[PDB]
Amino acid sequence: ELQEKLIAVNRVSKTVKGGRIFSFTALTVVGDGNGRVGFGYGKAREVPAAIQKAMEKARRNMINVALNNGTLQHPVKGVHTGSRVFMQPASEGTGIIAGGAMRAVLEVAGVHNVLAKAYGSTNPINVVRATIDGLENMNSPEMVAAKRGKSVEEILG
Amino acid sequence: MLKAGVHFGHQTRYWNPKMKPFIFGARNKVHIINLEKTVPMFNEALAELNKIASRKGKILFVGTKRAASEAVKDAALSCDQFFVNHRWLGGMLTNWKTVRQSIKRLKDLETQSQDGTFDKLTKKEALMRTRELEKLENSLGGIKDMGGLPDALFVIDADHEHIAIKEANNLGIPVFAIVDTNSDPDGVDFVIPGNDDAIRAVTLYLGAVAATVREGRS
Amino acid sequence: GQKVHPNGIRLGIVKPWNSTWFANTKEFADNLDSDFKVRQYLTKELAKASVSRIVIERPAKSIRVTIHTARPGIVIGKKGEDVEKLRKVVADIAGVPAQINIAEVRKPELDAKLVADSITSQLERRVMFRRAMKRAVQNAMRLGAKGIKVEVSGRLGGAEIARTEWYREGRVPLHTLRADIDYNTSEAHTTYGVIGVKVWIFKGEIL
């Protein structure tokens, strides 16, 4: 039922007394298409082993977000080590226009219309944090009403 | 309650500033624990432990400190519960899958033990097997007959057993540690202020818990 | 060149010979040559079957041959006509009269010769070597064995230096003489030269 995606694979080395030994890494994202998403990162001597090792690590690590008809009502921005991300809601008919790993994250998450953009550095591992960057720090009107001790209808007005 | 059979903090220079709400005035160079706000928290913790025991939750006891060892081993094995007495192994809970093999080896070794030297008289091998069993039993004696993944943990010293608390938080199991002045409430805890090195104090702590749990089954 | 041959080192401990007969200096070479000729002919003729091991024993004025195989029906045929053709040719090769026997291989996933030449046959049809290796190791572990190691060497498609790979799990102790290790090799001729295959199987330690 869950959707799985593969983002990037690269070869990584290490030096010992006799020479060099190589290894591979994989970055994957998993979502339910409805508001739950997680990611994982695995290493092994062979590509298939790393691929399969990232998946269940992603499965055990999930969070839920609160969208609304395919987005929510926040222009939100998030950061990690050297990456900035900007996402804002789109009206309708539009797609998931977004550059790299943001495309896969927003696709598996369940968003259908968004106007993302990426700044700063763009390596996949840190920009994938776009999950934790802003997706789960998003506020629905009902929880805002609960926090401020009021009712939704006059919070919106 | 009223007997005040529990002493108080270590010293004003070894203290965690997060313990200010529970602290009292300090007079003789050491901090004093306020008992006026410990009874309600203790009663709430006791009620929660009773309702968990009624759910046959397989409570767990820890607290290796060379002073509460026999105390926790006697409080446990009394009603129905298990305990950890020596050398909390890093990853009993997150890596329970591997620890099951050690438990199984202990079970096989003890089954063979009741008729051990009859199988073979090579005294070297018999002696080394006995030594291996003795080494293995203490680290898992209290947990051998457990299904796995208990539903509650009772911890005597908080900062001294931070690895167990981290494992419990990672798995998502409620904790019932006792916090002193030089420790801090970090995990999802039912915080119970009080001294943790006095024999009278620890005995008073464990007696109420044992009575509550042994009542909870019926 | 570092490893002693696993089969040879154990020939007097836990392993038997394949040719068992007595002779003197006059006929030693002739007996060896005859055994070589008959083994070569049998291997050439019975390629399509699954032949594993040929044991040759010389009765006083006679030669006795036993064949181990996993599909005896093909070798023995509808009636005993094909075994009779084989017996005629063998008795032609060696002057003395000959008799033939057939042995039965119960678990073809053991007896490393079968695994090795199965992998070679797969390689001859241009299939990825890694899948073959993993398939064989998984089958052998499923059927029950304390360990197995396979390896392949040669020009695996790339013009670069011929590479080497190997997989292993279980236990394969090679420095203990009590252990019962079965070892055999094979090689496959492709469009880019030959590829070598080696298999170790650890059936079980013997007291």
Place this chain on the structure above:
RNA sequence: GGGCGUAAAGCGCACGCAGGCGGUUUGUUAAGUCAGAUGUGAAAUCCCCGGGCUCAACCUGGGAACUGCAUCUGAUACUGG
């Protein structure tokens, strides 16, 4: 809508004119700021609702836009006198 400990980047350190920026009330002014109204901001071009060339480039009807300027009336929380 970027930076300056080590990647490029804090004057060797002070005093100080012109400039830039001002703690708390009260009272007046309406300069800044805000709201209306009028007069202006050519046509063509862009946009919206339409129309006609077999359709489309093309032509055409009406409306918005021309982020501005000046004048008059009003408001007085904030900045200025």
Place this chain on the structure above:
RNA sequence: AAGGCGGCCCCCUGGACGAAGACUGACGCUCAGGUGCGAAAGCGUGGGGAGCAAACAGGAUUAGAUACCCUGGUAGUCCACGCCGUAAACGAUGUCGACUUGGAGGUUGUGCCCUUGAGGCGUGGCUUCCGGAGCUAACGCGUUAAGUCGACCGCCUGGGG
């Protein structure tokens, strides 16, 4: 203020801090151009000259040794009066103001309590070392911020050339 300042005594002179009380009534902050002060070496005129010592001369070592090592040795280093205006002139961190969990010291004031004693309670200034949240590419910083903010100024825009 920075560059810097160490035997002892006298004369002239600047700043900082504390206690208590009185007084004036926003008189403030920053600062392009401008002005002043800046280690050592160096320059000019006149003195002085013990030790040390660029340049220089011999003796060694070395394949060579215009060097490191040894024996000497001039300018200079010192004083007075004028120039020069640069340093890894570094905490490699501009100046003011406000706010935010803690420990262990050093130095200099002052209030109270038996002031008994090297006692106990406080309350200011200036300084070392750990470390929490937070911040950072990381190292690390961490109430004397590289944390959360405001005012003004100075600089940066690939490496060589």
Place this chain on the structure above:
RNA sequence: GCUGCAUGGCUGUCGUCAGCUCGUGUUGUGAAAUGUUGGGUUAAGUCCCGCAACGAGCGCAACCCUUAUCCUUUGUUGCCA
């Protein structure tokens, strides 16, 4: 006949030196780390104790041959109290 720099198979060498890795779990954004480090021992990652690690694999050792001491069995072509 050419190409050991297109290869299989088979050898030398570091070196009979004591090392070389993996599964799961934790730490770090990451290359990686931990285990394999520390105290005492051994010919030896050989062993005890400690310790966010808990267990495995190839190595070391043992199982093989010969030599040194006795006991049974057999006694020629071997032996003579």
Place this chain on the structure above:
RNA sequence: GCGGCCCGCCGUAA
């Protein structure tokens, strides 16, 4: 505690 001892042609595994 201090005696001396310099160099290594051009490109080149995936």
